[PDB]
Structure 1
Amino acid sequence: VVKLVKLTFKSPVHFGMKRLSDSNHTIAADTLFSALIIEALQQQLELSHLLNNLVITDLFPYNKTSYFLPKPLIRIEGYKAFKKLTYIPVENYSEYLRGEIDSLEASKIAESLNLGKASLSTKVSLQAVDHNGESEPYSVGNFTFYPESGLYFLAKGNADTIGQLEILMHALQYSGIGGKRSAGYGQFRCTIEDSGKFDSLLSQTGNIAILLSSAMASDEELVDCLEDARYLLKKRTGFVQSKTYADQLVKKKDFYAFSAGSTFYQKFNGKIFDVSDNGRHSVYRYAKAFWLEGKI
């Protein structure tokens, strides 16, 4: 049961990269899945459905006109325009896979992305000032989406899993996503419905398979999948966000996952990876693979 979930962000969102100052347009599937797991823990919903039957996709830009998908990593025959290009609309995706898109069209597509404006809010901490100290400046990156634009993701799962996802997303609307939530960022409203265009696009058979989420194969299937594969091993890491994990904030075990848009000739079913060591509970890093087939 594929469900497209669109998110319109009332407030600017951090979605920070490794730096707090750094701001990203979107977040990977692991971040959204961690948010869902946190919400399920708060809402006291069972995690079996999310861990087993739920397959989500990296949040992707969408404008007033089209929905954007990550640029597939395929051989192309003005390479700089393609390299700077990051997201391709749904209709142009098949054309890009076939290779009909040229450098001028690639630049036009990259300019067509009207997701939002990235800014760097400058803030201070006055906690030290009371204690005979000095204010500490810091910077929080943010990405203010244009009113029609937002972030969408496809979630595939069982009907019960889809309903639990609906409840979790309804709660996450007010919980928020990304960084510096509960400090004025990350608030959004989500609308989840069946998407005809994505249901048709996913129901395709092609010689190549494109990752729609930050995923990583298990050690048994990596040998099969990695052959003839064009990918981008993105470093996913960070600190654990929970109250019961440890007395203090502890970094997650460093993880490396194939980025969205990576093309594999042989598909692999991703695995929920545990990146928690010496903690009271387990930290789930979502690396389940959402695949889109295509012909090149």
Structure 2
Amino acid sequence: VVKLVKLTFKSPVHFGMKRLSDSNHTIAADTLFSALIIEALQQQLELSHLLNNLVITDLFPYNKTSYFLPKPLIRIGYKAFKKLTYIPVENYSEYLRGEIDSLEASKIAESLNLGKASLSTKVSLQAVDHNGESEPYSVGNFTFYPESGLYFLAKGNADTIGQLEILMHALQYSGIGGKRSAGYGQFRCTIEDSGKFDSLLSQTGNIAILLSSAMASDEELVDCLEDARYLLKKRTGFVQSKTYADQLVKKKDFYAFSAGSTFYQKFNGKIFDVSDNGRHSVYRYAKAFWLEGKI
């Protein structure tokens, strides 16, 4: 049951990539899954549905004009083609067939208006009272245009879909990304049946494109890599919880194929464990959502 989940952001979001100063306009499926797990644990729900039947996608840019999917890594002005990152759903088939030209790719890049990124310079006055000093730091945020929003597609049974609806409503108050609970990431989310995507997903093409940041199991990896065009993205971070350890602990470093990576042989994903001797297992979504296309 693939359900579109559109997110409208009221306040700017941080979405850090490596540092607090930087910012991204989207987040990986794992970052969303980790937020969904944290929420389910707060609301005292069973994690079996999320860990066994929920399939999600990286949040993708959406505009009133169009919904943007990630640019497939398919061999085809090379600058114009490399600058392009997201292609509207209507132009995805044209891009796959090679019917797109460099000027058309430039127009597609200009078409997206997800938002306007910025850097907010904050200060910490915690040490001023102890003969210390104010400490400047920078938070990179991204402000969506009013029509613009981030959407994700969630697939699963009816039970996990309803659980997702509950977690999503709680999540909007919780927020997403970094510096949430410090002014950022408040969003309001709608869950609906989308005719566009379900029709798009009902295609049996010769190539498979990874909607979500995903990694195959070892046995899956050996068949999948042959003839694959892909971009290994390091997935790293600290553990966010009150019960994992007394102090803040980094997760084990993970590498996942990025969204838009094209694999000839489809691989199902796996919820990996990036924990290192903690009081609970830190789950890292790496399951795979596939858009089959014809090239």
TM-score interval, normalised by the smaller of the two chains: over 0.9
2:10 is aligned to 10
Distance 1:190 1:116 in 2: 18
Secondary structure of residue in 1 paired with 2:143: strand
- Normalised TM-score (structure 1): 0.99
Distance 1:158 1:114 in 2: 34
- 1:211-231 Cα shifts (integer Å, max 9, x gaps): 000000000110011110000
- 1:192-225 Cα shifts (integer Å, max 9, x gaps): 0010000000010101000000000000110011
2:107 is aligned to 108
Distance 1:236 1:117 in 2: 25
Secondary structure of residue in 1 paired with 2:127: helix
Distance 1:171 1:280 in 2: 25
Distance 2:156 2:10 in 1: 28
1:81 maps to 2:55 = no
Secondary structure of residue in 1 paired with 2:265: coil
Name the count of aligned residue pairs. 295
Distance 1:238 1:232 in 2: 19
Distance 2:97 2:52 in 1: 34
How far residue 55 of structure 1 moved from its aligned partner, in angstroms, is 0.3
How far residue 251 of structure 1 moved from its aligned partner, in angstroms, is 0.3
Distance 1:131 1:154 in 2: 50
Unaligned regions of 5+ residues in structure 2, if any? none
How far residue 24 of structure 1 moved from its aligned partner, in angstroms, is 0.2
- Structure 1 runs of 4+ with >2 Å offset: none
- 1:8-55 Cα shifts (integer Å, max 9, x gaps): 000000001111000000000000000000000000010000000000
How far residue 108 of structure 1 moved from its aligned partner, in angstroms, is 0.5
Distance 1:264 1:207 in 2: 10
Secondary structure of residue in 1 paired with 2:275: coil
Distance 1:121 1:213 in 2: 30
How far residue 144 of structure 1 moved from its aligned partner, in angstroms, is 0.2
How far residue 65 of structure 1 moved from its aligned partner, in angstroms, is 1.1
How far residue 154 of structure 1 moved from its aligned partner, in angstroms, is 0.2
How far residue 6 of structure 1 moved from its aligned partner, in angstroms, is 0.2
Distance 1:209 1:275 in 2: 27
How far residue 152 of structure 1 moved from its aligned partner, in angstroms, is 0.2
Secondary structure of residue in 1 paired with 2:226: coil
1:242 is aligned to 241
Distance 2:263 2:287 in 1: 14
Secondary structure of residue in 2 paired with 1:144: strand
Secondary structure of residue in 2 paired with 1:223: helix
Distance 2:243 2:19 in 1: 25
- 1:125-152 Cα shifts (integer Å, max 9, x gaps): 0001011100000000000000000000
Secondary structure of residue in 2 paired with 1:127: coil
1:149 is aligned to 148
- Normalised TM-score (structure 2): 1.00
Distance 1:196 1:211 in 2: 20
Secondary structure of residue in 2 paired with 1:118: strand
Secondary structure of residue in 1 paired with 2:6: strand
Within-5 A mapping of 1:118-267: 118-267=117-266
Give the share of equivalent positions with the same residue, in percent: 100
User: RMSD of the alignment, in Å?
Assistant: 0.4
Distance 2:257 2:129 in 1: 47
